[PDB]
Amino acid sequence: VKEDNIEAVGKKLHEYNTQFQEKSREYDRLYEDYTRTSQEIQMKRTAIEAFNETIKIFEEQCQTQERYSKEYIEKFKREGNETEIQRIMHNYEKLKSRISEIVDSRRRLEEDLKKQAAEYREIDKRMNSIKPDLIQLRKTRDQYLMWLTQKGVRQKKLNEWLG
Amino acid sequence: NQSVVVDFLLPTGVYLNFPVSRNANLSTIKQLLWHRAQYEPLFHMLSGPEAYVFTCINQTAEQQELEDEQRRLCDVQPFLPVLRLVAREGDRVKKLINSQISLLIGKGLHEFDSLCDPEVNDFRAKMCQFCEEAAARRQQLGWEAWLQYSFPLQLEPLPNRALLVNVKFEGSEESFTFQVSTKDVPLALMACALRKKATLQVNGRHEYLYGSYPLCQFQYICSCLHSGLTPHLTMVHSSSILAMRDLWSLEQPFRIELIQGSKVNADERMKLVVQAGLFHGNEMLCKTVSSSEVSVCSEPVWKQRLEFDINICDLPRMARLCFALYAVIEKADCPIAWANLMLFDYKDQLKTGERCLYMWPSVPDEKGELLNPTGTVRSNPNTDSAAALLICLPEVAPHPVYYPALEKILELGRTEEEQLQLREILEGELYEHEKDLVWKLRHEVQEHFPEALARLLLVTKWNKHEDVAQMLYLLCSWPELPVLSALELLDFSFPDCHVGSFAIKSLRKLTDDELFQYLLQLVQVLKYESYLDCELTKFLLDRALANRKIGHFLFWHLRSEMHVPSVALRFGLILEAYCRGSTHHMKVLMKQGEALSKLKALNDFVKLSSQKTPKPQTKELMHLCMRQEAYLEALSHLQSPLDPSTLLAEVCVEQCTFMDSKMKPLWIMYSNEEAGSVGIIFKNGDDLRQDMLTLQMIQLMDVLWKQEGLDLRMTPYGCLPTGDRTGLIEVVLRSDTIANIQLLLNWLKSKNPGEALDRAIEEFTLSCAGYCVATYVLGIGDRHSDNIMIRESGQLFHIDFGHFLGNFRERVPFILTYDFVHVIQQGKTNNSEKFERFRGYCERAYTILRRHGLLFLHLFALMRAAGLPELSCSKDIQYLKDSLALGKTEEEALKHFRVKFNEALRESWKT
Ligand SMILES: CC(=O)N1CCN(c2cccc(-c3cc(-c4ccnn4C4CCOCC4)c4c(N)ncnn34)c2)CC1
Structure with a gap:
C-alpha cells in the first residue's frame, strides 16, 4: 500500500479494481479465442484424416482398376474391340484426374491448419503476457481491501469503491 | 442447392460421377447408379444391386458401411460426396454397431486405436465384453425382468379413497371403466378387469403398472388423483412385451x-x-x-x-x-x-x-x-x-518393479485420558498435534468410531510405506459404512484405490431411485479418477445395464461433455461400452441425437433470421424449414430425452415458436392422438449444468420432504444438457410469469372458480414455502417476478437460475414477497390462521433439510469436479453449513430461522 490516508487509499482501491475488472475481461475474451481455436484445430486435423482416408480408397480403386483391367484389355484386343479398351482407359484417366482434385483440396486444408496453428500459438503468447499483469492487479486490489478492513472501514464504503 | 455431384467407385475399377438430390435415400441412389452404370464399361460383370453396399468416409474420418439404405444422403453426411460399392456379406453385425457408436458418442472409435496405449485397449477388451455378456444375459431372462429393465417403476416417495379407473386392450377401441380402492395392488386391478372382460401400461406413455405396490403409490395415479382426471390404461400380457424385447528394498x-x-x-x-x-x-x-x-x-x-x-x-x-x-x-x-x-x-x-x-x-x-x-x-x-x-x-533394477500385492501389503501391516481426548477431536480440520493422536489410537477409531474412517485416512502419513500398510490393513477389516459416509470417500482427498473400492462396496446398497438422485455427482467424480478401469466405472456401467432410465441419463451425462478435452477419452470409452450392452436403447438415443442435431441447425437459422426480419416473419420462415421431410421425420416420433417414458409423437408446427431472450430458445410443441400436449425447449448458447444441479437439489428436497409426509406441491421440470452450451428444458403447460400476470388473485379467480379457489390458495401456500426455503438454502439471489412462475392450478415455481450460493459471495436473505403473503392470506390484511400455517410449512421444510444437511455438503463437495465457477472451493460448500445452520443445535437453528423469517416479513412491508 503506497499511500496512508483512508479516502486516498479508497480511490486507489476503486482504480485498481476497475483496472482488474478490465484486464480480467480481456483475458476471458482471449481464453474464449484459445478454446475456440483449440476446437477448430482438432476439426481441421480430423478433416485432414478424412481426406487421407478418401485418397486411400481412391488409391485402392486404381489398384483394383489395374489388376481387373489386365484380364479384359487382353480379351477385347483379340476380338478387335479396341473401342472397349479405349473406354476402360479413358474412364481410368477420369478417375486419376479426380484424385488430383481431392489431393489439392487436402493441400488447401494443410495451409489453413498451419496458419491457424500459428494463430493459436500467438493467442497463447498474448495470454501468457497478460497473466503476470492480471495476477498483480488481483494481489494489489486485495492488499488495499485488507488495509481498509484493518483500518476499520465500513462495508458500505468498501462496496462503494469496488462496485 | 438441392442437388450434389457424387463420385461412384465400382468394384471393377470403373469411376462414375453424376448429380443426385441431397435429400435422396441410398436405396434410390443405388438405382440411379445402376441406370447410368449400364452405359459405362464392364457392367456385364457386376452382380445385382442388392449384392452390394455403399461405403463412405463419414464426418469422424472413419469408413462406414451404409446398410440402412433408407437413410438420406444428408442424414448420412459423408465427408466428401464419394461412395464405393463393396461386397455386402462379411459379418455386418459388428460393422453396423461399431459405426453407429462413433456417430452416437461424437468421437470415432479409430481415435482410440490411434493412441497405441495398452490401457485404452485393455479397457475396451474388458468393458465391451462384460457389457456384451450382461446384454446377452438380459435377453435370456423372463418377461417380468426385462419389463423392470426397460420400464422401471416410477413410484412416489395416507388415506384410502375411491378411484374411478379406465381400462382397454391393444387394437380394441372399446373401454371398460370400473372403480377400485386407492390402496389396491395392480394384481387385483387387472383381476377385477379380467372378470369384467368376459361379461399394466399407461397409453401414450412407456410407463407400466406392476409389482407388489398400491395403485396410489404410482406417479400416474398420484397425478390423476390431484388433477382430478381418470387413469386410462391398456391391459397387455407376455405376447406384446416379447415383441418389444425382440520393491520395498529400493531405499534410494x-x-x-x-x-x-x-x-x-x-x-x-x-x-x-x-x-x-x-x-x-x-x-x-x-x-x-x-x-x-x-x-x-x-x-x-x-x-x-x-x-x-x-x-x-x-x-x-x-x-x-x-x-x-x-x-x-x-x-x-x-x-x-x-x-x-x-x-x-x-x-x-x-x-x-x-x-x-x-x-x-x-x-x-x-x-x-x-x-x-x-x-x-x-x-x-x-x-x-x-x-x-x-x-x-531412471532405471532402478534389471527387472521391472510392481507395487506390492494385497497379500504382501496386509503382511507388513499386521490409555483412558487420551480416549476422552479422541472423543473431543472427532467432534473439519485436524492440526499436527491432533493428527499424531488420532493415528496412535487408530485401532480405537476402527473400534469406537467406524464413521470417522475419513478423518483417519487423512491423518495417515502416505509418504511412509510403513504407515500406509497399517492403514490399508485396517481398511480390509473396516465395518461397512452407510451410503452417506461412502459419498464423502469419493472425493479427490481419498485417492487410494482400496478406499474407492470400500466406498463402492457401500454404494452397492443403493436403490435405483436413490442412485438416480446422485447420478450427476457420481459421473463428475470420474474426473478425479487416475486409471480408465476403476470400480466406479464398473459400478456405473453395471447399474446402467440393469436399468434403462439410469442408462439413459448416464448416456446424456457423459455425451454432453464429449467436447471437454480432459474427459473426451474417458467418457468416450464408457459410452462405447454402454452402447455394446444396450443395442435396443442405442436405437432410441440415435432418434434423439438426430432431432437434437436438426434443432441446433434450426436454432442457428432462427438466430441469424432474427437479426434481419421481425418475429412473425422468422416464425413462418422457421416453420417452412421444419415442414421439410428430412426435418419433420427427425423431429417427429421419438422418446423424450428429458424423460424417456414420454413419447414425443406429432410436431405441432403451428404451435412451434422461439423465445425473445439472450440466446433465442426454440419452443417445440407435441400432440399425441394415443395419450397430454407435451412441450420441450431447445436452448443453445449458455451452459445448462448449473440449472440442472439447482433443479436436482430442489427435487432431492421435494423427495426428502415427501418422505416426512410433507408434500409442498413443487414443480421439478426437466432440464438436460445434451452438449456444448446445448440442452433441453421441459415445458410446464398452463403457466406464466408473475410479471406477465401483473399486466394475481384475479388470475387465480379466472382459473379456479368456486370451491377450486381454496384448492389453488393451498397449492400456492405449499409451493411458496418450499421455493422460499429452497432459494434461501441454495443462496439463489436475483428472484423477481420475471423468473417466478405460477401454474393455473395455483402452484408457484422458480425458473432460470444463474447465480448459485450467493455469487451474484454475499449472504442471500430469506425472502417473503408482499404479493405472495397477500395471496396466502386469501386477500385479508390479517389472517393469523392461514399465515401461521404457512410459517409452519417453512419451519418444517427447513428442519427436514437440516436433518439431511451432510447429504447436501457431500453432494456439493463432489460437484466441485464439474468446474462450475460458483462451486469451486470449500467456501461455496461453507455457504450451505451457514444457510442450514449445521454448526448449531436444532432449537438454536429454528430460533435464528424464525428471526430471519420475521425480518423477511418486516422488510416485505418496506417495498
Ligand atoms: C405459448 C407460447 O408460445 N408462449 C407463452 C409462454 N411464454 C413464456 C413466457 C415467459 C417464460 C416462459 C418460460 C420459461 C421457462 C423456463 C424454465 C426454465 N428455463 N426456462 C426458459 C428456457 C429458455 O430460456 C429462457 C428460460 C418455462 C417453462 N419451463 N415452461 C413454460 N414456460 N416457460 C414462457 C412463451 C410464449
Whole structure:
C-alpha cells in the first residue's frame, strides 16, 4: 500500500479494481479465442484424416482398376474391340484426374491448419503476457481491501469503491 | 442447392460421377447408379444391386458401411460426396454397431486405436465384453425382468379413497371403466378387469403398472388423483412385451531427468522455471523441488536432475508427479502450463524411461498455487499445438518393479485420558498435534468410531510405506459404512484405490431411485479418477445395464461433455461400452441425437433470421424449414430425452415458436392422438449444468420432504444438457410469469372458480414455502417476478437460475414477497390462521433439510469436479453449513430461522 490516508487509499482501491475488472475481461475474451481455436484445430486435423482416408480408397480403386483391367484389355484386343479398351482407359484417366482434385483440396486444408496453428500459438503468447499483469492487479486490489478492513472501514464504503 | 455431384467407385475399377438430390435415400441412389452404370464399361460383370453396399468416409474420418439404405444422403453426411460399392456379406453385425457408436458418442472409435496405449485397449477388451455378456444375459431372462429393465417403476416417495379407473386392450377401441380402492395392488386391478372382460401400461406413455405396490403409490395415479382426471390404461400380457424385447528394498531417493520443453510461447525478456512436487490427493509427499532459470524460447533445454526428499520404497500407489512451467523475470510470476503423471502405471509397474507430457494451460484463480495436483493425470489431446515437457524416469533394477500385492501389503501391516481426548477431536480440520493422536489410537477409531474412517485416512502419513500398510490393513477389516459416509470417500482427498473400492462396496446398497438422485455427482467424480478401469466405472456401467432410465441419463451425462478435452477419452470409452450392452436403447438415443442435431441447425437459422426480419416473419420462415421431410421425420416420433417414458409423437408446427431472450430458445410443441400436449425447449448458447444441479437439489428436497409426509406441491421440470452450451428444458403447460400476470388473485379467480379457489390458495401456500426455503438454502439471489412462475392450478415455481450460493459471495436473505403473503392470506390484511400455517410449512421444510444437511455438503463437495465457477472451493460448500445452520443445535437453528423469517416479513412491508 503506497499511500496512508483512508479516502486516498479508497480511490486507489476503486482504480485498481476497475483496472482488474478490465484486464480480467480481456483475458476471458482471449481464453474464449484459445478454446475456440483449440476446437477448430482438432476439426481441421480430423478433416485432414478424412481426406487421407478418401485418397486411400481412391488409391485402392486404381489398384483394383489395374489388376481387373489386365484380364479384359487382353480379351477385347483379340476380338478387335479396341473401342472397349479405349473406354476402360479413358474412364481410368477420369478417375486419376479426380484424385488430383481431392489431393489439392487436402493441400488447401494443410495451409489453413498451419496458419491457424500459428494463430493459436500467438493467442497463447498474448495470454501468457497478460497473466503476470492480471495476477498483480488481483494481489494489489486485495492488499488495499485488507488495509481498509484493518483500518476499520465500513462495508458500505468498501462496496462503494469496488462496485 | 438441392442437388450434389457424387463420385461412384465400382468394384471393377470403373469411376462414375453424376448429380443426385441431397435429400435422396441410398436405396434410390443405388438405382440411379445402376441406370447410368449400364452405359459405362464392364457392367456385364457386376452382380445385382442388392449384392452390394455403399461405403463412405463419414464426418469422424472413419469408413462406414451404409446398410440402412433408407437413410438420406444428408442424414448420412459423408465427408466428401464419394461412395464405393463393396461386397455386402462379411459379418455386418459388428460393422453396423461399431459405426453407429462413433456417430452416437461424437468421437470415432479409430481415435482410440490411434493412441497405441495398452490401457485404452485393455479397457475396451474388458468393458465391451462384460457389457456384451450382461446384454446377452438380459435377453435370456423372463418377461417380468426385462419389463423392470426397460420400464422401471416410477413410484412416489395416507388415506384410502375411491378411484374411478379406465381400462382397454391393444387394437380394441372399446373401454371398460370400473372403480377400485386407492390402496389396491395392480394384481387385483387387472383381476377385477379380467372378470369384467368376459361379461399394466399407461397409453401414450412407456410407463407400466406392476409389482407388489398400491395403485396410489404410482406417479400416474398420484397425478390423476390431484388433477382430478381418470387413469386410462391398456391391459397387455407376455405376447406384446416379447415383441418389444425382440520393491520395498529400493531405499534410494526419487529422481527425475528434466530434459526438454517444446512449443513454449512467452515473452522473450523472461526466464523459464519448472516446479515439480509429489502428491497423493491434495497432500504433498515431499518438498517442491524447482529447476534452473533458462532463456525464453519455443524449445528450452534443462538436462537437469531433480531429486525429491522421499526414498522410492516410500512412494504410495497413487503417487502423482505434478509439473508447472513458470515464466519468471530473471532475478508477479506467470504460470504457463501444468501436467500431472502417475508414478505407477495401470498394471502396477513403476514407470521407467522417457515420457513426453503434453501440458495443459494454467488459469489464474484465487489460489494461485504453483502446482495443480487435482488436474487430469492424462495428456493434452491437442498434440498438434500444445506445449510439452520431455522428462525421463531412471532405471532402478534389471527387472521391472510392481507395487506390492494385497497379500504382501496386509503382511507388513499386521490409555483412558487420551480416549476422552479422541472423543473431543472427532467432534473439519485436524492440526499436527491432533493428527499424531488420532493415528496412535487408530485401532480405537476402527473400534469406537467406524464413521470417522475419513478423518483417519487423512491423518495417515502416505509418504511412509510403513504407515500406509497399517492403514490399508485396517481398511480390509473396516465395518461397512452407510451410503452417506461412502459419498464423502469419493472425493479427490481419498485417492487410494482400496478406499474407492470400500466406498463402492457401500454404494452397492443403493436403490435405483436413490442412485438416480446422485447420478450427476457420481459421473463428475470420474474426473478425479487416475486409471480408465476403476470400480466406479464398473459400478456405473453395471447399474446402467440393469436399468434403462439410469442408462439413459448416464448416456446424456457423459455425451454432453464429449467436447471437454480432459474427459473426451474417458467418457468416450464408457459410452462405447454402454452402447455394446444396450443395442435396443442405442436405437432410441440415435432418434434423439438426430432431432437434437436438426434443432441446433434450426436454432442457428432462427438466430441469424432474427437479426434481419421481425418475429412473425422468422416464425413462418422457421416453420417452412421444419415442414421439410428430412426435418419433420427427425423431429417427429421419438422418446423424450428429458424423460424417456414420454413419447414425443406429432410436431405441432403451428404451435412451434422461439423465445425473445439472450440466446433465442426454440419452443417445440407435441400432440399425441394415443395419450397430454407435451412441450420441450431447445436452448443453445449458455451452459445448462448449473440449472440442472439447482433443479436436482430442489427435487432431492421435494423427495426428502415427501418422505416426512410433507408434500409442498413443487414443480421439478426437466432440464438436460445434451452438449456444448446445448440442452433441453421441459415445458410446464398452463403457466406464466408473475410479471406477465401483473399486466394475481384475479388470475387465480379466472382459473379456479368456486370451491377450486381454496384448492389453488393451498397449492400456492405449499409451493411458496418450499421455493422460499429452497432459494434461501441454495443462496439463489436475483428472484423477481420475471423468473417466478405460477401454474393455473395455483402452484408457484422458480425458473432460470444463474447465480448459485450467493455469487451474484454475499449472504442471500430469506425472502417473503408482499404479493405472495397477500395471496396466502386469501386477500385479508390479517389472517393469523392461514399465515401461521404457512410459517409452519417453512419451519418444517427447513428442519427436514437440516436433518439431511451432510447429504447436501457431500453432494456439493463432489460437484466441485464439474468446474462450475460458483462451486469451486470449500467456501461455496461453507455457504450451505451457514444457510442450514449445521454448526448449531436444532432449537438454536429454528430460533435464528424464525428471526430471519420475521425480518423477511418486516422488510416485505418496506417495498
Ligand atoms: C405459448 C407460447 O408460445 N408462449 C407463452 C409462454 N411464454 C413464456 C413466457 C415467459 C417464460 C416462459 C418460460 C420459461 C421457462 C423456463 C424454465 C426454465 N428455463 N426456462 C426458459 C428456457 C429458455 O430460456 C429462457 C428460460 C418455462 C417453462 N419451463 N415452461 C413454460 N414456460 N416457460 C414462457 C412463451 C410464449
